[PDB]
Amino acid sequence: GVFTDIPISNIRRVIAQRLMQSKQTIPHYYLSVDVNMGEVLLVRKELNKMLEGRSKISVNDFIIKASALACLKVPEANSSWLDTVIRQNHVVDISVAVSTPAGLITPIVFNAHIKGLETIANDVVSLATKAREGKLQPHEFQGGTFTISNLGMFGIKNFSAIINPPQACILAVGASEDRLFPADNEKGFDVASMMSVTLSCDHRVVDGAVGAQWLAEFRKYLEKPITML
Amino acid sequence: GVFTDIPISNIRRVIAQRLMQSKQTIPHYYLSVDVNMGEVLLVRKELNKMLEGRSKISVNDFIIKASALACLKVPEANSSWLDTVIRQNHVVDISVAVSTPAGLITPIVFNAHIKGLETIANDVVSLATKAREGKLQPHEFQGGTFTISNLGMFGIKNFSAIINPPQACILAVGASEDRLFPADNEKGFDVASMMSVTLSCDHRVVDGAVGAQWLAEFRKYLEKPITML
Amino acid sequence: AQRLMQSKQTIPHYYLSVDVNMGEVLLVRKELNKMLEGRSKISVNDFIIKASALACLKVPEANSSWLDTVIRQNHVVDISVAVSTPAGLITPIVFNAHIKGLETIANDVVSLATKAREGKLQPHEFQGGTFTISNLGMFGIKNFSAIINPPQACILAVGASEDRLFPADNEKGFDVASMMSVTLSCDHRVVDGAVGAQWLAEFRKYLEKPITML
């Protein structure tokens, strides 16, 4: 025929009310900056060489570590509005979003401000075995104080997601491309890799100047990785 | 005096309630990509040569054809949320938006997945005679399953429109500019034309990975037009 | 043997001919098969089915049928491709060839070879159609002239792609090019001389520049 009618399952029945609660109440406003990823690609080149056989370190692992350290400098991006109490947290719990064919479910990486890179890289892979094959506990994917969502593996340059209702921030990462800049070369130009980031704050707990300094710290760690020490 | 008071007519009285219904209920989220338009400009150069006198083919005609073919590969961007039934359509009905001095009215191009380019180009022009001179039937501009809105004729690089309430997607096209890329030239760089596109999905029926593949197909047709066959 | 004798006695056949430059089709299917790796393969007998279905829309009198009181004019192109089994000559039907793309037709021609050669056809799958393409270029035949199906008004007949040479504006004076010889066979009761000569003027024009198919 012309149109085909499909009933609604119980997974999307629950998700569709979390989305409508989030957009009606929370006054979103967006921010943007682009990050030079030229020095991360030379660090993970030789960290994977010294760490042969055991594990592998990806570019989505430096982003989880740099986000947990930047929330300690500016702690207002780690809060929650509870209509009477701005609950300020001291523990960073990054909820990485991953995409299954069944939907969009977010495993949680607890205590991301004390763990090293190799401990996180074996947590992201080991929770892909849990989430994609349906072995999650209800306390393993519900919670957290922050959220990173990545769509750079599909070619998207920018997007702007929807904040989890108790949380105040979310991140949104584009795809790493190849641009060129004016330099002090004899030619006049160099080539460099770039990456476009889009924060999405809650305006009730995060002002304009506060969230603009979160992206000033997040840019500074990923441009020189030695500063993470 | 200081301020001048104007009453509200019955055209903007109806539009202002469609807008407020759309933003309150639908949880929008945005996406973006840029498209190389270097090979479309060499096809419409010599299609207008072989089609002398009769009609003229514009760059806003390849976009209507590439959008109707991309909805067949990824059919979830062609649905509708009806609070109990996700009505999935099999017929693509693109509603092109045009701007009159009286307002913003959207003529409908029916069955855009079977028509050729010359049939669409004589439908867009012939509906400009209908819409701008006020000869539309109520079933000629109300309906459709998709929407393309173009503002590249004013210099806007990016924008993000508002979805029609029954529909799930909308498109938003910037203006074709002239950038330059690093190449394998002896110099090191080439010059190319680009164009910036901004999708705006409904998050209740379209996930993140689904809408990111719609822009992966839409980019692929307009970069090599022979793939449309 | 009774369908053949009915066809030649009643229908007053007359033949037509033209040759088509296939130089630009071979550069399109070279890079369509590159972008379509693994899934399917696009042959030169697939552009001919698509160009024939589009040319019947420009000149609709080559798509009719004589019924002795009514010239039934059709609006739906149903090309009946003829294929050769060891059991005989049977014609699977490709329905609605004027809206389908090239990859949809190429997976219909192969999938009906599984049906027809292995004997799994329904009687409504090979009986009908409004047009007929018959190809013998895989045996070296340059020209032939087939027999029209009795309700239908046209048939096509394709030769083998050879290599000729033409006078050009070269410094040498000549270039080399690939050619292909086509032979239409009309029914003179519904198709005149000037009408069928414009069908081959459109069929030649699509296959010489494939971008015109859009």
Numbering used by the authors:
A (entry chain P), B (entry chain i): 1 to 229
C (entry chain H): 16 to 229
Task: Quote the authors verbatim.
Pyruvate dehydrogenase complex (PDHc) is a large multienzyme assembly (Mr = 4–10 million Daltons) consisting of three essential components: pyruvate dehydrogenase (E1p), dihydrolipoyl transacetylase (E2p), and dihydrolipoyl dehydrogenase (E3). These three enzymes perform distinct functions sequentially to catalyze the oxidative decarboxylation of pyruvate with formation of nicotinamide adenine dinucleotide (NADH) and acetyl-coenzyme A. By irreversibly converting the main product of glycolysis to precursors of tricarboxylic acid cycle, PDHc controls the carbon flux in carbohydrate catabolism and act as a gatekeeper to maintain glucose homeostasis. Mammalian E2p and E3BP jointly assemble into a 60-mer icosahedral core scaffold with their C-terminal inner core (IC) domains. Exterior to the core, E1p and E3 are noncovalently anchored to the peripheral subunit binding domains (PSBD) of E2p and E3BP, respectively, forming a flexible outer shell around inner scaffold.
To investigate the overall architecture of native mammal PDHc, we have extracted endogenous PDH complexes from porcine (Sus scrofa) myocardium based on a conventional method of mitochondrial multienzyme isolation. We then collected 11,575 cryo-EM micrographs of purified PDHc and processed the dataset with single-particle analysis (SPA). Averaging images from 2D classification revealed that while the internal densities maintained a regularly ordered configuration, the external densities appeared irregular and diffuse, indicating that peripheral subunits exhibited significantly mobility and were non-identical among complexes. We thereby masked the external densities and conventionally enforced ortho-icosahedral symmetry to determine the IC structure at a resolution of 3.66 Å. Similar to those of Homo sapiens and Bos taurus, the porcine PDHc core presented a tightly stacked dodecahedral scaffold, consisting of 60 repeating IC domains, in which C-terminal region of E2p (residues 418–646) was appropriately fitted, whereas the N-terminal regions, including LD domains, PSBD domain, and their inter-domain linkers, were excluded due to their conformational flexibility. Within this reconstruction, adjacent IC domains are compactly trimerized to form a dodecahedron vertex, which visually resembled a tripetalous, pyramid-like structure with a height of 70 Å and a diameter of 80 Å, reminiscent of homologous structures in the cubic cores of A. vinelandii E2p. Comparable intra-interactions were detected in porcine E2p vertex, wherein each trimer, with a total buried area of 4,272 Å2, incorporated multiple inter-domain interactions at four different regions to maintain structural stability. These twenty vertexes were organized into scaffold assemblies through hydrophobic interactions, with a classical double-handed manner.
